Symmetry: none
Subunit: 352 residues, 2 copies
């Protein structure tokens, strides 16, 4: 048999923007639901830019790009940045620093990096492109580097507008309201040390799923709505289909996460719904349940118990609705909500 | 999947005859094997009768028949009793009470009820008909009410003679129960999904009768190989019953068959069985009925195979019973205690 032991429970709350505050800009990271809707959350890439020479750059290679947080193929990331910078047609030489460019899965998120950089430059010098030109440039960079970012248009819109009002659903408007969902649920990204941080997204957006997601969000407003047609329920229905998909072979970790969450959902009223993804599990809990240590431990134990390979850690990130990309100032620095997380250290050992 | 949980294990042993110790008579209930042989067991219908008026009854409706145990279509049962009583040509008015008229399947057993009543009257007034006439009256009642009682003649013989010596096999013919009894515990197993009311669907035959007769006689040899003993033949019959082409078995019979075949292969104590509409007749090694561990395993296997959730499984230990008789303070202890064990279970769908 196997014995699952909790070797640590470490909760944290931090306000990263206060630490880094030349111009500073932020662009929110996103998470997706039913492969067709995107939510900007309270995690963001920050870009600090300082003009070091008031003259025309010899080329985009002249700018100093600081310690880019280490990640897989970070040299490719530099190439992408150099190309984007080239298209911005800068008239000064800059020193640029990037902070927190990794998303919830720990994967580099190119879109918020480029948008934060754009916002930084927009406030640094004149003659910087508008939003429409920005989208054209971003599409060019994505195509040139063959980046695999499903529903890039919705991701870009979510990054520019944020989700304190809407969830960005693929065009058919097509968006749904987030107010009521937020009042009733805690959105949590759960990940084990076995979930990959490097992967090619395998998503299956569709107009059918887009409509379901939109209606679910809009139905959160009616207190009388049957739970089986609310967001958590549709996330779960989508998750069940994802692991039974004919044109998708799910990861072992996705399969095991599905079994664990299905059990948890049926046993705990606080676990309302979820959807497994390649980088982790997006879970909907009753409001404030994220702060219930007993529940968190039970979720971690269930996941560790079902995973066929021994898990050593399970992280839980509480995701609040995030604002749209913007320049950061002393005046607006508190528009950012602290980021809450809890990580459990685990030991799953074969025993007599 | 599903989770099977045992919520209770309740054993009991009772001596019902002592409770009613006018005239009191008893007639044994029976169980059948291979649809062709009948065994009188240690469960019996009891009839208490007292004359309330020393005069010719105005009609059979005059007798007071106390609250008959509640059962399906009990008014029909009353009609049968009234007709039987009419044929007995009684010369006094009686108050009659019936006790334990339901068989192992929970089904009303007309034959023991009528024979116990006859024995009661035989000891109450002069001129009551003899055994030969009784059989004629019973045949008339069974025909008039179109009762569906397979092998009625063998059932009647078993009720009158008991099985402390023989198993009553359809005429061609009986076998001896002596050897079988020393080596096995006969147990009737039933779940809450087995019907208590049903039309018996049995297939008696001379081929099955001969197999049964020889098996009982072969029990005598301690060298005789099991494949030709009673438990083995019961099992062979059961396998064919669920495979029959002129019988569509019940869902509970099919699921019971699967469970018992698995149990029989894994446990040496489970020697043979036969599924029936009202339950499962199982042959266990002598005294194995008192093995709590085995009993629980049998219950769990049945619950695991049943497609619908079972909530209880009962086990009745059946000893060989004596023939119908008047009960007296002198023979009241000739009845062996009735042993039973019931398990409460929960079979729940789970993630």
């Amino acid at each position: 048999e196997r014995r699952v032991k909790i070797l640590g429970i470490d909760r944290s709350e931090n306000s990263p923007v206060l630490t880094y505050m030349s111009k500073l800009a932020a662009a929110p990271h996103t998470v997706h639901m039913m492969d067709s809707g995107f939510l900007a959350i309270n995690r963001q890439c920050l870009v600090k830019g300082k003009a070091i020479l008031a003259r025309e750059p010899k080329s985009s290679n002249e700018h100093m790009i600081d310690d880019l947080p280490k990640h897989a193929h970070d040299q490719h990331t530099l190439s992408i940045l150099r190309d984007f910078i080239d298209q911005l047609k800068l008239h000064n030489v800059y020193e640029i620093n990037f902070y927190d460019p990794l998303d919830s899965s720990g994967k580099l998120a190119v879109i918020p990096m480029l948008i934060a950089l754009w916002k930084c430059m927009l406030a640094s010098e004149t003659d910087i492109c508008d939003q429409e030109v920005l989208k054209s440039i971003m599409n060019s960079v994505i195509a040139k580097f063959e980046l695999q970012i499903p529903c890039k248009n919705a991701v870009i819109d979510a990054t520019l507008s944020g989700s304190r009002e809407e969830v960005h659903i693929i065009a058919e408007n097509s968006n749904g309201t987030t107010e009521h969902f937020n009042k009733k649920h805690d959105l949590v990204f759960v990940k084990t040390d076995l979930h990959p941080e490097d992967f090619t997204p395998q998503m299956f957006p569709s107009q059918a799923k887009a409509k379901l997601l939109r209606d679910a969000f809009n139905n959160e407003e009616d207190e009388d709505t049957f739970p089986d047609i609310l967001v958590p329920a549709y996330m779960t229905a989508h998750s069940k289909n994802r692991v039974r998909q004919e044109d998708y072979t799910c990861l072992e970790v996705e399969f095991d996460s599905q079994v664990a969450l299905e059990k948890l959902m049926n046993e705990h009223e606080q676990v309302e719904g979820f959807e497994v993804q390649q980088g982790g599990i997006l879970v909907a809990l009753k409001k404030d349940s994220f702060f219930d240590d007993e529940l968190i431990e039970k979720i971690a134990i269930a996941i560790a118990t079902e995973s066929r390979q021994s898990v050593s850690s399970v992280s839980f990130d509480l995701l609040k609705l995030g604002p749209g990309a913007s320049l950061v100032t002393l005046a607006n620095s508190r528009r950012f909500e602290p980021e809450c997380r809890v990580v459990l250290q685990i030991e799953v050992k074969p025993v007599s």
